[PDB]
Amino acid sequence: DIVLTQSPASLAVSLGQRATISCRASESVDSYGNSFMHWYQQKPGQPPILLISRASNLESGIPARFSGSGSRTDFTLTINPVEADDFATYYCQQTNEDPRTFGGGTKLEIKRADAAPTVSIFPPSSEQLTSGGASVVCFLNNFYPKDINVKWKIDGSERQNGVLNSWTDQDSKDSTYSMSSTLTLTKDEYERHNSYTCEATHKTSTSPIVKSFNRNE
Amino acid sequence: EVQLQQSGPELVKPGASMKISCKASGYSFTGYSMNWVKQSHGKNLEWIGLINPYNGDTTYKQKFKGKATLTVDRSSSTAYMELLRLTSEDSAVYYCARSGRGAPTTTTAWFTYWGQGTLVTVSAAKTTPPSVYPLAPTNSMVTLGCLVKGYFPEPVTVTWNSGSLSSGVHTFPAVLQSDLYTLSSSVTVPSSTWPSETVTCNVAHPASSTKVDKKIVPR
Amino acid sequence: PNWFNNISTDLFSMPGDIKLGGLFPIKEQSSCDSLNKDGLGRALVMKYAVEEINANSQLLPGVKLGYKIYNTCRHSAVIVRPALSFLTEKSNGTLSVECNYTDYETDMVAVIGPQSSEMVTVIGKLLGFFLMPQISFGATSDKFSDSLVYPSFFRTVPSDIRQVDAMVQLIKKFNWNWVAVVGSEEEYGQQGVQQFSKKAEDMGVCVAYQGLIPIYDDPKPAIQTIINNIQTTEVKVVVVFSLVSPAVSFFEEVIKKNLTGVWIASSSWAISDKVYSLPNIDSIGTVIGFIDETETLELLSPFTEVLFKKIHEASPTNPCPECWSLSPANVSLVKEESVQRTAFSVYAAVYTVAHALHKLLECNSAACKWSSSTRLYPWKLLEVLKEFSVNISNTSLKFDQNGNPNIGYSVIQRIWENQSLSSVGSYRSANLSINETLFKWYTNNSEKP
């Protein structure tokens, strides 16, 4: 089986700059005077889209800012200039030998200025309480880069159990990420404590961003 | 237009078998190979095999022989893929994809058309409807939320005011805990508009036949 | 011109020492019931040419040219009998079954017409076997350029292989590369669509879609598919290589789905009144046309005025049953743009044969080697016509080894506001020569697509 190694695995390119993705085949994918290396774009939650066939043929309806080159065992996909809607995973595929194989993919991230998150905190709803559960939710919205750290603090002490975290994929419009942190407690555990603190640590601030409520209010 | 319409998401018990369909329209069904592709979350794309709908000839990646079975029904222009003796490792998204035109061989064909994908969840766990809780909190903008808790299996859809509110919406990918999923959505609107103009979180969970609309009321 | 006074009122038969057979589309099907004004007019041009040759005492001196014209109905069944009748023995009125027709004197020495390429494919090899020269004034398929396949075919208009080169050159000039081609489904439109496509492929032009408009059948279901494929390819250059009658049905439907874009017209409808007279035709956008580049016959209209008066005077005494009700009112037949701009082709066809006969009979201006004993075999006439050169009016006409003429095209455009045709360039040899600044683009902001 032909192995496809894509590089780099992960890439951030600013709006309007040039993105270069490579694919190396363990064996030649040349035959019939052609190179059967193809490039696909996959947006989150969507089917892949064919960008380029046979190493350098742009498919109908694909912008000319995408292009491909190479032969035999070395291939490049180029995106120039990179636009906001171009974040995706990019796969190379060879169809020279059975079985068809795909490369591991390359994640293209739109690079932008660092942005601190807009943080919101929400105590459990009275409706969730009637069920005996108590989820405290924290939104950390529109930040860059993706790396962030969220601490939960109850009455001054850190809390690790019950925290569930989830990132969105990058935003088309403003190239940011968002994240929600959910602390799921029992109702009783929620009533044993007064103040609840969501703490965000990010490369934009030297000190954490903190949102708190007291259960009193 | 060429459309590949796959069947909806499936929850299947381990050890069981299931069949995925792919209904083709907009072209001559027997003119082109139908391919199938596996994508496991943490996404590598893997070719399972293809079928020639004209004569039913099949070709499989070795590891899928005896695991997948490709068939077609020409009377209805549908390609099928049966998965057998299912394990948690068969949990993935499965795509049908039609070969293009221009390759010298059926082997060398690339994939120009894809179906929308079929999620397959292999689990003994049972179908549970979600509980939908409202998240209410000044400031210029205000953020509201919607917690979608304790459901199974995937997926759920969340919209806000039936799609009226599109901008300033974040729907976060669900998280699996004790065989139950939880997700949240946030929306950000002008303070001027809320609480005066109603903001409602719409949640659907097809698996359990569940529609819910939660009004985000203040406190 | 006083020789006008001597002309006879006989439209489709003229007695004479040597006769030309004529084949025109004078009455078609809507049973050949439907008069074709252009076909009649083109027949009038042959009438005029023959009268004029006979009035010229230095061309075929003392030898009278006559003819017999028949309706083709653009139909196989109809045309076969006239063509066979041209081949009957001049003195018998019958066609003998022979193996060798070398000493056999056919009633006609040459044939003028037919108009249609579909029609030439019906009779061409028949006439070819007798080596009877046929000069077509309207049949443009490149199929007839093979003299091993069509041994006696000539034409006074160019092969469509040149017209599509003209068409693909224009499209390259306007940097259009995604186009759709529509043809009528029969010899002309089929050959033209194929020829266009091999040339467009060869000249780096992508053909998005090919379609054929039925000429039997009901075309409307085929037409709606075509228009669909056009709309969904989102192309806005459409080449329509079609006969009038199906193109009308085509554009009828284009209108009712208000599509617009650039339309390229083959010579067969580039100047058709029936197309341009359609309601809301000016909706469709820009129409660019190619037509044979011809002289005007300045005498055609005066001639017809006098003829139609003489005919009216003789109206109380068959290609066209109702033509004996013709009148000086009906002079509009020849003054129609279709007839006027193609008339020279009929005329040159007849003169070409006349001059060839002159040479064959070793005429000078005073006499010919001719008498009542003279037997004219069409195959001896053919030898003279092979690669023939003749000045006709102000044209230097030359036939090549293929029977094709040194006649090029005038590129034209339809101007909707005064319902007219503007000249925007030309095609001579393989040189397309147009002036972009002369084009009116029928678009939102009046620029080019």
Add this chain to the structure above:
Amino acid sequence: SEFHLRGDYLIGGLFNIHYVAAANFQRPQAIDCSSKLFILPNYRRFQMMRFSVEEINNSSSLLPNVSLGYQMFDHCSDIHSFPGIFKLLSVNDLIRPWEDPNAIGVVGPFTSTHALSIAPIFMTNLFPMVSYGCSGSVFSKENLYPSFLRTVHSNKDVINAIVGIILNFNWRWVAFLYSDDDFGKDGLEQFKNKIEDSEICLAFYKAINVNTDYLQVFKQIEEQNIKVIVVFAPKVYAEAVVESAVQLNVTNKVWIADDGWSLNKKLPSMNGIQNIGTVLGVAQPVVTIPGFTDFIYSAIFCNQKCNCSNLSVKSLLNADPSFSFPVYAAVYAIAHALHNTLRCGSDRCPKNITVHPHMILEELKKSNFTLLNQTVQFDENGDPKFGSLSVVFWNSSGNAEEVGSYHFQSLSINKTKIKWF
């Protein structure tokens, strides 16, 4: 003479026994075909018509006490065949162009090109033609060819089968070599229509003659790396392509033949043939015509001269037998239509009843009889409802080994029987 047989009703027979390349001519006269290149399988078909008539004349149930006769012709040139045609249509060695004749029907011609030249003349008076070989798709149109029928299928069906073969395997680049005539150009148009919406890509095509620079053709095919070559063309052109392929060191191709040459007897036994690769094809299944072998051993105006004595009976018998049943069925369809037009019973026919050719035509259209356990019928278009296709392979013994079937009302191939060169 072989070409003429006296009888109560005459059938025309249009055949081309000799071949000649098209060439300039300066006199309006018939070609002396007898001095040109003899074509053995065509002569065999010529005999098949003579045999069928003799068989019917031997019959007391089909046209009882009514003899069938023929006027037959060897028209090596479509352009020069009109004297023979004139003879069939003449009313007393004359033709009167304006009337509503010698023969009641005609069998032939063999090629679309012959047919297109002469058919209008026959159509005009609804003179029936029953062609044993003309496969141009345009003849399916009754408005164009109202008295035309045939006993071979249209090019569309044969093209369909050929596309079936291609889709059964893994190659999708294709070269279509086709004869530079109406038959070839029609196959091209049908081939294109069928594969437009499909994985199959026409990567090269060319109209070909015996004159074609085949070195350049094959250089172009190799440069494009095309492995599959469809040669859609008659005997003379197919041998041109393939003999040139052997001579110009073409190797490792997959050749695909239509039924006009998949049963060719010359090419399989040719020196070097195994080197050009593998020849597959669509073929007419060999139909046994009981009694024909004996008949051959017994049998051995312009264009009625064979000049082919010193002919080997075994060469003739073993020649390409394709279009045998079509000829056989064409003659029988006509005899049955006469039988039924005359309202013959099992025992007798009325006689000296005069039969205008057009009267034959409605009985021809309604044809419905069995013949060698096949059912002879025509559809609305005058195309045949009988006959099937084999898929064959040329094996290392020089035989067209059957490896599969195509039946027009819905292809199977045993792929293991095919050895690949």
